[PDB]
Amino acid sequence: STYSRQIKQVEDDIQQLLKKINELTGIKESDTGLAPPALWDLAADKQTLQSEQPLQVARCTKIINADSEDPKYIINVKQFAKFVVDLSDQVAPTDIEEGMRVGVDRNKYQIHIPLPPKIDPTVTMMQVEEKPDVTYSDVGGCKEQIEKLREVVETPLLHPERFVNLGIEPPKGVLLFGPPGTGKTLCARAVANRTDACFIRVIGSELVQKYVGEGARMVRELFEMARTKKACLIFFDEIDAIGGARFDDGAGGDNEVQRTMLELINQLDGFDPRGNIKVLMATNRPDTLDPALMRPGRLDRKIEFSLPDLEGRTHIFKIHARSMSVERDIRFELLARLCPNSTGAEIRSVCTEAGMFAIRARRKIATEKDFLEAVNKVIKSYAKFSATPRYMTYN
Amino acid sequence: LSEEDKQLQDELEMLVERLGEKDTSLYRPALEELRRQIRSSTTSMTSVPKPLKFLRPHYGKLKEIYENMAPGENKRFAADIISVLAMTMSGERECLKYRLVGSQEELASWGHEYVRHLAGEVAKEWQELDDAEKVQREPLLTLVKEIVPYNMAHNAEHEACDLLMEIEQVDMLEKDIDENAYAKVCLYLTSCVNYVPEPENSALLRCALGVFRKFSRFPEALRLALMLNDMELVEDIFTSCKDVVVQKQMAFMLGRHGVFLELSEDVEEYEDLTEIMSNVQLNSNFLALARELDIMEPKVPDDIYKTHLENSARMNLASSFVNGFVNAAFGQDKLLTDDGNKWLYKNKDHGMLSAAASLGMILLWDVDGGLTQIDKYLYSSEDYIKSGALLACGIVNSGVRNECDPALALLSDYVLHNSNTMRLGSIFGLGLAYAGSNREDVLTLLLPVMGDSKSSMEVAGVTALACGMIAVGSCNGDVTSTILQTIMEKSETELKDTYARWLPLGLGLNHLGKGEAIEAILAALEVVSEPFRSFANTLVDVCAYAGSGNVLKVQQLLHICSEHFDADMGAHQGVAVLGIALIAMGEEIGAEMALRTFGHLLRYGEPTLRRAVPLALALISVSNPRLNILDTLSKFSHDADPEVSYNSIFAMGMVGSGTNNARLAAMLRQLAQYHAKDPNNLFMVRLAQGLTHLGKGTLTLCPYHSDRQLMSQVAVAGLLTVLVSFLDVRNIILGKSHYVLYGLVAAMQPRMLVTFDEELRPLPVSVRVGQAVDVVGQAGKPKTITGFQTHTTPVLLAHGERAELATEEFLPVTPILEGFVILRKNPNYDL
Numbered sequence A: 001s002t003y004s005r006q007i008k009q010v011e012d013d014i015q016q017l018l019k020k021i022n023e024l025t026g027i028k029e030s031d032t033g034l035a036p037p038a039l040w041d042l043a044a045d046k047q048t049l050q051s052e053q054p055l056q057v058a059r060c061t062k063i064i065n066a067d068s069e070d071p072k073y074i075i076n077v078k079q080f081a082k083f084v085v086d087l088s089d090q091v092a093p094t095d096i097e098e099g100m101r102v103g104v105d106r107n108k109y110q111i112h113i114p115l116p117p118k119i120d121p122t123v124t125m126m127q128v129e130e131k132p133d134v135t136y137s138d139v140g141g142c143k144e145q146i147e148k149l150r151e152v153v154e155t156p157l158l159h160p161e162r163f164v165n166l167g168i169e170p171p172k173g174v175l176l177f178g179p180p181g182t183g184k185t186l187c188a189r190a191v192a193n194r195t196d197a198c199f200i201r202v203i204g205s206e207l208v209q210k211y212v213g214e215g216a217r218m219v220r221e222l223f224e225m226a227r228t229k230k231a232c233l234i235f236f237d238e239i240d241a242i243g244g245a246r247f248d249d250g251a252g253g254d255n256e257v258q259r260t261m262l263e264l265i266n267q268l269d270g271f272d273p274r275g276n277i278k279v280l281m282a283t284n285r286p287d288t289l290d291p292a293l294m295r296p297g298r299l300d301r302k303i304e305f306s307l308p309d310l311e312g313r314t315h316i317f318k319i320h321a322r323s324m325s326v327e328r329d330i331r332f333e334l335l336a337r338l339c340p341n342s343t344g345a346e347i348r349s350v351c352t353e354a355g356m357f358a359i360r361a362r363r364k365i366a367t368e369k370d371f372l373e374a375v376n377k378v379i380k381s382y383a384k385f386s387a388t389p390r391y392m393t394y395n
Numbered sequence B: 001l002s003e004e005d006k007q008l009q010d011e012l013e014m015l016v017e018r019l020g021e022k023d024t025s026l027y028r029p030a031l032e033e034l035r036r037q038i039r040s041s042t043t044s045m046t047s048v049p050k051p052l053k054f055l056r057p058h059y060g061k062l063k064e065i066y067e068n069m070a071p072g073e074n075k076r077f078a079a080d081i082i083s084v085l086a087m088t089m090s091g092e093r094e095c096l097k098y099r100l101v102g103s104q105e106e107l108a109s110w111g112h113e114y115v116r117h118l119a120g121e122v123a124k125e126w127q128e129l130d131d132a133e134k135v136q137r138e139p140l141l142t143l144v145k146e147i148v149p150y151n152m153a154h155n156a157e158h159e160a161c162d163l164l165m166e167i168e169q170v171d172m173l174e175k176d177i178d179e180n181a182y183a184k185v186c187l188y189l190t191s192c193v194n195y196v197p198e199p200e201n202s203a204l205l206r207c208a209l210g211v212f213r214k215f216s217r218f219p220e221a222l223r224l225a226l227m228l229n230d231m232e233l234v235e236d237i238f239t240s241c242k243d244v245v246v247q248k249q250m251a252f253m254l255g256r257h258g259v260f261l262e263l264s265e266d267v268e269e270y271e272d273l274t275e276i277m278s279n280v281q282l283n284s285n286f287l288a289l290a291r292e293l294d295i296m297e298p299k300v301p302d303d304i305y306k307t308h309l310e311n312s313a314r315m316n317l318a319s320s321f322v323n324g325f326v327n328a329a330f331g332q333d334k335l336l337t338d339d340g341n342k343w344l345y346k347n348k349d350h351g352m353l354s355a356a357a358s359l360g361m362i363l364l365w366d367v368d369g370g371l372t373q374i375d376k377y378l379y380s381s382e383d384y385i386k387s388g389a390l391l392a393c394g395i396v397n398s399g400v401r402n403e404c405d406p407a408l409a410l411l412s413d414y415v416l417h418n419s420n421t422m423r424l425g426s427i428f429g430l431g432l433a434y435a436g437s438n439r440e441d442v443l444t445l446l447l448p449v450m451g452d453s454k455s456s457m458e459v460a461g462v463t464a465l466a467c468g469m470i471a472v473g474s475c476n477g478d479v480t481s482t483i484l485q486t487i488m489e490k491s492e493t494e495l496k497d498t499y500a501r502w503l504p505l506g507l508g509l510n511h512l513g514k515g516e517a518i519e520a521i522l523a524a525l526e527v528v529s530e531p532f533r534s535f536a537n538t539l540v541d542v543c544a545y546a547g548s549g550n551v552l553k554v555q556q557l558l559h560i561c562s563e564h565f566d567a568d569m570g571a572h573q574g575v576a577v578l579g580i581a582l583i584a585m586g587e588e589i590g591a592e593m594a595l596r597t598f599g600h601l602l603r604y605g606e607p608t609l610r611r612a613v614p615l616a617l618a619l620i621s622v623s624n625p626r627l628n629i630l631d632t633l634s635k636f637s638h639d640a641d642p643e644v645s646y647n648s649i650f651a652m653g654m655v656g657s658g659t660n661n662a663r664l665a666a667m668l669r670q671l672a673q674y675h676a677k678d679p680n681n682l683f684m685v686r687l688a689q690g691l692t693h694l695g696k697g698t699l700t701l702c703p704y705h706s707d708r709q710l711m712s713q714v715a716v717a718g719l720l721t722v723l724v725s726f727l728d729v730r731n732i733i734l735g736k737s738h739y740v741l742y743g744l745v746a747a748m749q750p751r752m753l754v755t756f757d758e759e760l761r762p763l764p765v766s767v768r769v770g771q772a773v774d775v776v777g778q779a780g781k782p783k784t785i786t787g788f789q790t791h792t793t794p795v796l797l798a799h800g801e802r803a804e805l806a807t808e809e810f811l812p813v814t815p816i817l818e819g820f821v822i823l824r825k826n827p828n829y830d831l
């Protein structure tokens, strides 16, 4: 308390000093998207505003007299108009092709710069930019499943030289299936964390659109932007949202979703080669998927995430209780034996509920009795709401 | 008006009336009742008697009672009421006075808040008192000797610390430390030392050291003495302890710090202690870790570049640097440990210098096996290969003290070679091998090289860098004298060469962290011509105040940076910018404050001013990939000034050096794609990629260890060498002198947590690794880690990540769980 007066004096001085600094330097606005003044290259901004002319985005339609020295290019300037223009002197004639987006000036509309193809922003955001915080060490009891998944989705990208030499074409599709909570999306997150290529996460419900043909358009643009990369991975979580089998119910039952699924199938294995895209789909209802989607060349590997066995359940218990403040003699093998048919999610909940039982009793260490009560509460008491017994008929 | 409040208001008159009667028979009961009445409300912290606050003027009637006659019992309780009242207003020389002259009973009987105010006033008047008032502190010492145990009784140890700190009398604190509070008081005093200046720096340091020594806490006492760089105190601490295991742990700490001791053969367990302190077993321990952490497979630079995901002599040299950095201290590589002659000759001119020298990086700390691979390239006829292997010898021997000096033997016969390249390799290897040794034999062998006529300016600068690295922080007279002679012997036009910039640096390395020992050196430098004189003076001054946090020197450096010049005259501005980081790196608050100053320097500064800000950011955040610095450097990676771009990219590499950061790797790959057509920028990007995966993520370049409280002088010297050489990245790094990057070898340490048994065998133990939490202040047991995970002990600790034993089966010998730690079976466990 003896320093309190000086504490407040120096604190107020510091606040006044910070305000004074911000007075000379900057840090304001932030609602009109203004960068801090330390990054303001105003002279270069003026030089850009004068020298660098704006360019309207158009689409080239037809090249007339491409062979001769006066090729005319019909461009469709979006909602503006259609023009017959010529390339600028700084663009090679072979750099502009029919049907590609270009950027032209506003005076004579001469083509000034070829442009990347238009991609829906919703499709663009589907690519993963922050890798998940899950490694393959966080998935227990899935040794064979993880190995099979990695030798399809990771090994060909990491070491392609081992495959080209033997004339070997690795599988380009994996379907992870199993009851809910078995670790399909966990393994997908592990893949996305370990991968170095472009990873795109697509949820099936995201491919359902209001208008007719829009979902197929999103699928087409997804595979178009996936082909603009040397190697790419597309994850289709809950593919049963759009991957259902085709049927005719008199009315137009699921016709648009079937068209979206057909577009996805055509992209996977159709007349045109798919490319270096290696797709990955996870579903808890693989019985509903279309037979054409469940076919090799589209889903070559079918990895089953069945419920863990005794060793797998013990491994999952060790994984989830690693950072636990457990006692010294926790019989995790016994706990794994006490939940015969249980998913990894139930095991994680058992660990969490044992910790919660210990916390509720104001204890810093969870005993074996706490884990037994957690098993009773989660595996036994909550067994009414278990998704397991219904969903292993589907898998 | 409360009825009891009205009664106490009656006591303002009726009790004073009892004290107004001539006879003393009514004086004692009324005064004692008032003294107990003060305690009546003192029983509640918030409750204070508001009626006595109206008795403050009533002291006029009581003025004669406490002043005008005998002090037996009349003034005794009369003055104490005035003292309790004086807690309310300013109390300048009052609240102390009546407690001093009045009753001298137990202090806490008058309240915790009252005694807190009294202690604050004691410090305030102690500052006022002059020498002639030494006969005024007789009661003051008694008050402090009673206040300190009272503060420690009610867990108010930190408040006690301020009291002796203000009066500059912390010395008696060690007398009254109990076993329940030594850790807290020592922790608070050590946390305070980073901000108090000299001589209170050493005073606080020695006081906490004495407290630790009294309690036989030998490892932390040794840490504290190492913070004091008191070699005599290091020796005394090491030989005072009788526990062999504690001495082994302390030897591990000394070996990590780079401090070595010459023990006596009479000392028990001399052999193993010397081996621990010499880090001869560092290579085997590192390889055992890597085998446990299944990372022994070599990594080709292609796996780092990842060119298959991307939608020349310089290229080959950059790739050799990447191969050396990624596989550092692993002993295996698919590119040079195989038949590397094709690869090594794929490089051209001075590239062959670094590439062959890079072959020494994979064999770091492995002297016996490393020289066995150097020998093959030692006999190469090409001028560059032999000297590159010579420098690889010192790189291999760097960080490990061999009893029979191999590097000196292999490099002595080439420091006066006619070819300047064989020389260049030999001095640099010798400097790396014997960094932080102050070995008189090596220095005497090396020193005449600087004065040799055949020695070029490049050679002279390399010799200065080496001799500084051997004698870093030692204030060696011989090295200082010869460096001064070399500096003033050169012509003014000769000093225009940037290799002369290395001459002060070694001089600066000589007095690294010494402080105010440079005034003679500065006076000597005053006679040197300009603008080299300003450069040299700035360099040596900064190196002297390295890692001190002296805001005055930072103010001087900012004044140097203030006046900008419309290059040639402005060279020392970059040194000042680097010096802001070199001084502010000591403590976290200063570094985070200096980050804003670096931003302002980048914003308002001139090119030469802003060409060094990335180097300052790299120095202040090396191996610490915090996102703010990474984003700041990324904003200037594609800078208009090429030098700013090169420095920003290299600083991005150094900041995440050894961190294996995925985000930084993505940024570096994107920069490599962006800078594909710029050979210099692409080379810098490859260097950054190599640094980011240094030692496959198991090595750090941070100069601070022991919970970021101990500065490694050798690491600082290596980082300083590389960064100061980067002030002329166009001519030194991108030129023919890229071998100076191997100075980073001096700063390579493993981010380690290896738990050993009492017989030094590995001992896997469950531990919790998480971001360090400041535990100053808050009492009881506060958690020192947040967001932690449980791993087996052979785990790599990131920057700012502490580790605490998960269970209590083992007791650590030292509180700091970094590097090699010895664990002992806990007697309480399994009771």
Ligand SMILES: Nc1ncnc2c1ncn2[C@@H]1O[C@H](COP(=O)(O)OP(=O)(O)OP(=O)(O)O)[C@@H](O)[C@H]1O
Pocket (backbone or CB within 6 Å): A138, A139, A140, A141, A142, A178, A179, A180, A181, A182, A183, A184, A185, A186, A187, A282, A283, A284, A316, A319, A343, A344, A345, A346, A348
């Ligand atoms: N094999 C496993 N090893 C470790 N933890 C597991 C395993 N399987 C599941 N878990 C845990 O249970 C959680 C279940 O979520 P997860 O995303 O894996 O389910 P899912 O199989 O995708 O389910 P759904 O079919 O409902 O989408 C995981 O987040 C993880 O914490």
Ligand SMILES: [Mg+2]
Pocket (backbone or CB within 6 Å): A184, A185, A186, A237, A282
């Ligand atoms: Mg899922």
